[PDB]
Every structure is written in C-alpha cells, then in structure tokens.
Design an enzyme around this catalytic site. Structure first.
Site, short mmCIF file in Angstrom:
data_model
loop_
_atom_site.label_atom_id
_atom_site.label_comp_id
_atom_site.label_asym_id
_atom_site.label_seq_id
_atom_site.Cartn_x
_atom_site.Cartn_y
_atom_site.Cartn_z
N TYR A 122 -45.07 -47.01 14.37
CA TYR A 122 -45.79 -46.18 13.42
C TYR A 122 -44.93 -45.87 12.20
O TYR A 122 -43.70 -45.94 12.24
CB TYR A 122 -46.27 -44.88 14.07
CG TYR A 122 -45.18 -43.91 14.49
CD1 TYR A 122 -44.58 -44.02 15.74
CD2 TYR A 122 -44.78 -42.87 13.65
CE1 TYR A 122 -43.59 -43.13 16.13
CE2 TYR A 122 -43.79 -41.99 14.03
CZ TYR A 122 -43.20 -42.12 15.27
OH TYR A 122 -42.22 -41.24 15.66
N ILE A 157 -51.88 -36.25 18.32
CA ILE A 157 -53.02 -35.61 17.67
C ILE A 157 -54.29 -36.41 17.93
O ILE A 157 -54.24 -37.55 18.40
CB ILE A 157 -52.78 -35.47 16.16
CG1 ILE A 157 -52.58 -36.86 15.56
CG2 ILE A 157 -51.58 -34.58 15.89
CD1 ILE A 157 -52.55 -36.91 14.07
N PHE A 193 -51.48 -43.46 8.12
CA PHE A 193 -50.52 -44.03 9.06
C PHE A 193 -50.61 -45.54 9.08
O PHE A 193 -51.71 -46.11 9.08
CB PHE A 193 -50.76 -43.50 10.47
CG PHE A 193 -50.47 -42.04 10.62
CD1 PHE A 193 -49.18 -41.60 10.82
CD2 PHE A 193 -51.50 -41.11 10.55
CE1 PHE A 193 -48.91 -40.25 10.96
CE2 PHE A 193 -51.23 -39.76 10.69
CZ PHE A 193 -49.94 -39.33 10.89
#
Length: 107
Positions: free
Chosen positions: A26, A56, A99
């Site tokens: 990521y 999340i 992201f």
C-alpha cells in the site's frame, strides 16, 4: 463508497475471503496533497487478515473486490475512515483519501 479502477493484469478470480491472511503493498496519498503512509519505505508489506475490522472500512471493502496480482486505486470517503474525527497530526477532519493498492497475497 469504494470506487475501483484496476490496473489490469493479474488473474481476476482469486478472491480474498474471511479467515484469509493477505499481503498488500500500500501507499497512501492525500487528495490535493502529499504522501502520508507508504509500505514501500519500510519494505515490510503489512501482513494482515480479513474479518477482524483491523483496517478501516474503506480499505476493507476494497480488499474483497480485488484478486491476486491486481493493482487498484482506492477512493475513501471521509465518513468511513476519519472525516468526523481526524487522525491526530496525520489526518485532518473531513478528509478524502487515495490509496495505491497492489494485492500479492497468500492463503
């Protein structure tokens, strides 16, 4: 809201399920802003599982909508991650996140 724009190659069928541990390269990017988090830096690509709400909600639903080898591009709404609260010093309140996610998992 989880919007997926997949950089194509992969297999498109190995779907992550519950009880499966996955490995994600990521890199977080702020909308109209700079970086805030990157797995490329520490080179430990963050082994984690699915089904414990550790991540999340915007990143979790993006995990299930991918497959092995794919390269997605998340668009996280403020209400699902930090927008009312704001992560102290790192995320201001009412913030929309981007992201860069590549799924090279196991299991």
């Amino acid at each position: 809201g989880v919007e997926i724009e997949t950089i194509s190659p992969g297999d498109g069928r190995t779907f992550p399920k519950k009880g499966q541990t996955c490995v994600v390269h990521y890199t977080g990017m702020l909308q109209n802003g700079k970086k805030f988090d990157s797995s490329r830096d520490r080179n430990k690509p963050f082994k984690f599982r699915i089904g414990k709400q550790e991540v999340i909600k915007g990143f979790e639903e993006g995990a299930a909508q991918m497959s092995l080898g794919q390269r997605a591009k998340l668009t996280c709404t403020p209400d699902v991650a930090y927008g009312a609260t704001g992560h102290p010093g790192v995320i201001p309140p009412n913030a929309t996140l981007i992201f860069d996610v590549e799924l090279l998992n196991l299991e």
